Design a protein around this ligand. Structure first.
Ligand SMILES: Nc1nc2c(ncn2[C@@H]2O[C@H](COP(=O)(O)OP(=O)(O)OP(=O)(O)O)[C@@H](O)[C@H]2OP(=O)(O)OC[C@H]2O[C@@H](n3cnc4c(=O)[nH]cnc43)[C@H](O)[C@@H]2O)c(=O)[nH]1
Ligand SMILES: Nc1nc2c(ncn2[C@@H]2O[C@H](COP(=O)(O)OP(=O)(O)OP(=O)(O)O)[C@@H](O)[C@H]2OP(=O)(O)OC[C@H]2O[C@@H](n3cnc4c(=O)[nH]cnc43)[C@H](O)[C@@H]2O)c(=O)[nH]1
Ligand SMILES: [Mg+2]
Ligand SMILES: [Mg+2]
Ligand SMILES: [Zn+2]
Ligand SMILES: [Zn+2]
Lengths: 348, 356
DNA sequence: ATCTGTACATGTACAGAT
DNA sequence: ATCTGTACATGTACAGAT
DNA sequence: ATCTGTACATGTACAGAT
DNA sequence: ATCTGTACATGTACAGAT
């Protein structure tokens, strides 16, 4: 009952959705049209909306939108960057960019900045570049603050890279036919490299499966009718929302949690959903115990320093090399505390 | 256990499948290549394998194959033939290969089928690899049927079809009631696929006879057979096996056996049982209602359903609800009562006809 | 040279054979 | 419980056409 | 190669019935 | 409270026209 009323607080308003979307769509459509003109290197780039808003798991307000501008590329040969699983060099129009991620992103970013400078009807600027990040982030004032991440992506139609062979373990949940069809879709590379100061970073791209993650969110049941008008509602997305909120709230309060992000929770729950495939293990009447079992799972991930990327099994998002034990133990104690005192942090 | 051993008898052999398929594919590929040549009116025609063999419900032997040669026909206007739901006249916006088959604005099914049949007969005459002839035309059929002797007798039905990409005709709006079984997303996607029209080609002697076409949903029926569970993993390597297809096979066999022996059953076909079981699968959507351990009771409940359909003279086409396949006007009561008694008899005496 | 319709290459589910 | 033939969807190479 | 129109899924909102 | 039915809103795939 507490959790139901938290979800009520978290629920977006139809009026807010409508206002935010109309502005975001104006800006996005204009940026997309600009990419098609002239001898733009990105002519042919196509739109693909990703992330929480388009998966219907956005919480609190419609203030963060993620959009991929994907470009199909001819005869690309990938080379995995030192057995990381997720990172690659790309070799073989785009001639004036080994295809450099940073050079390509810089040009993309330059174009966007120009078009935004010409927008006179919307209060919209381009956020200062964050090193390593693949995104060009727009800040809109509607007058409410809305952030739009525009992610350049390469689209490849070939077989998925071998690092993913054993990934997407949906065979007992969504099934072999679903999995085979999903893997016949393209895969994407995004200009996230790392700003480590460590490796050949400026030329590195990262695999993206946002298209696949979107499909799963919207086709998330073992029964074909899960959450449809002639099926039974489950509480899978509601558990995701609650876990997203716990992390958001904790991150606002504690700088110690800077290394943690929403993708950690998304990844964790994909694993939970695989482990508990039955729709009846996610009955709405069991929201508390479902949300609880998710926390326990997340805690086991933290304690064993083990959270494998859902698509790239060898890539541990909770490896020592990415997040120190100190930070995992800190988050562990905080989650345990909220869990054992009726989630005080939910109370605003 | 009895039924398991019947299904063992019914199961196709890999050796038989391999030999039959090699020959069927040769012939079909050659016929298809001939359609692409010259100023063939059927240039652009594409293949689509349909029916029991490609749905994995063919029984006893791999001796009957059904293949659709579909031709995309843009900017087509349909007119429903006397509120039948299934039958249509096909006209064109524009007044073009098909010009040769027009009658004013109206695309003649029989003229188009005749030409299709003429071409096929020629190509078959040129085949010296295998013993293959073209079966005498059956009135009331859209098919050109090949008889192959590979030594064994194999039949191939080649069905001419128009493909239309528009929304499905309104007679189907309330059809395909899969919302509680396969769901709304599946249903919406299925109805975005094309629909097909095949020649009626009856010699009934009613008006517009030779120009009449019938809707086909074999593509949709194939998808359903191979994606037949409420659970995505039904019958998959990481799921639970069901007995849905096994029930279909048993029902198919009962009708086949009865049809061999009794001429009274000439009006009945396998599509009647397919239709009946689509309704049963909708009525009992849960995979657990089709547990393998319950094969007998599952097969029994299907017979009861089929019997109710016969006795009340009511079996609605699954895609076109207003079209009753068991109407008086299609099959007389005499025939329905005959089949009724025969099914009841087998049901109540341990299926003697399975032992033949 | 560049483009393209056709044929082949690759991968896997399904179900039969072991 | 594993192995294997067919069907089928999608990607890619290429002789012939431009 | 681009744009619009259509259909319907995924949502929110809320009244009346349970 | 919860469920059902209707209204109102957006997102998304794809056919047909340009
Ligand atoms: N998507 C994604 N994020 C990852 C990955 N590895 C680490 N991250 C970090 O997790 C956060 C996810 O933010 P969002 O993608 O906006 O999340 P949702 O929309 O699902 O949900 P909300 O939390 O409600 O918004 C980020 O902090 C991200 O950090 P980062 O440095 O990797 O990227 C920064 C932003 O870049 C965009 N982005 C990055 N990768 C992708 C991608 O593959 N597709 C689309 N956008 C991407 C994104 O907008 C980030 O905010 C990881 O593998 N995937
Ligand atoms: N498919 C189909 N058949 C129908 C329809 N209305 C009546 N029928 C009659 O049912 C029989 C079906 O035989 P098959 O199509 O081979 O069945 P399966 O493959 O599912 O199963 P098996 O029994 O194991 O082979 C026929 O007797 C048919 O009679 P008909 O005179 O109308 O047609 C004879 C053949 O024509 C082909 N055909 C007819 N309609 C279609 C269609 O819509 N699509 C594809 N082929 C079709 C078929 O090869 C027949 O044997 C009805 O609506 N559909
Ligand atoms: Mg986001
Ligand atoms: Mg057949
Ligand atoms: Zn659900
Ligand atoms: Zn099944």
């Amino acid at each position: 009952d507490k959790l139901k009323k938290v979800l009520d607080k978290l629920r977006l308003k139809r009026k807010d959705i409508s206002e935010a979307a109309e502005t975001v769509n104006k800006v996005v459509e204009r940026l997309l049209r600009r990419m098609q003109k002239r001898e733009s290197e990105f002519k042919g780039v196509e739109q693909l909306n990703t992330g929480s808003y388009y998966e219907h798991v956005k919480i609190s307000a419609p203030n963060e939108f993620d959009v991929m501008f994907k470009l199909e590329v001819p005869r690309i040969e990938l080379q995995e960057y030192y057995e990381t699983g997720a990172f690659y060099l790309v070799k073989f129009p785009l001639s004036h960019f080994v295809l450099s991620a940073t050079k390509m992103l810089s040009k993309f970013r330059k174009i966007i900045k120009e078009e935004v400078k010409e927008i006179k009807d919307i209060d919209v600027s381009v956020e200062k570049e964050k090193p390593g990040s693949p995104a060009v982030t727009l800040l809109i004032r509607n007058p409410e603050e809305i952030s739009v991440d525009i992610i350049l992506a390469l689209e490849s139609k070939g077989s998925w890279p071998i690092s993913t062979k054993e990934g997407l373990p949906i065979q007992g949940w969504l099934g072999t036919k679903v999995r085979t069809n999903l893997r016949r879709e393209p895969f994407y590379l995004v200009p996230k490299n790392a700003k480590d100061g460590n490796s050949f970073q400026g030329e590195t791209w990262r695999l993206s499966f946002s298209h696949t993650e979107k499909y799963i969110l919207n086709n998330h049941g073992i029964e074909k009718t899960c959450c449809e008008s002639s099926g039974a509602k489950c509480c899978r997305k509601e558990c995701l929302k609650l876990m997203k909120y716990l992390l958001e709230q904790l991150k606002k309060e504690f700088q110690e949690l800077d290394a943690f992000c929403s993708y950690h929770v998304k990844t964790a729950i994909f694993h939970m959903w695989t482990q508990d495939p039955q729709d009846s293990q996610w009955d709405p009447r069991n929201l508390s115990s479902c949300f609880d079992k998710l926390l326990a799972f997340f805690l086991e991930c933290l304690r064993t320093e083990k959270l494998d990327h859902y698509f790239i099994p060898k890539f541990n998002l909770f490896s020592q090399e990415l997040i120190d034990r100190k930070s995992k133990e800190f988050l562990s104690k905080k989650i345990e505390y909220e869990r054992n005192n009726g989630f005080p942090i939910f109370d605003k």
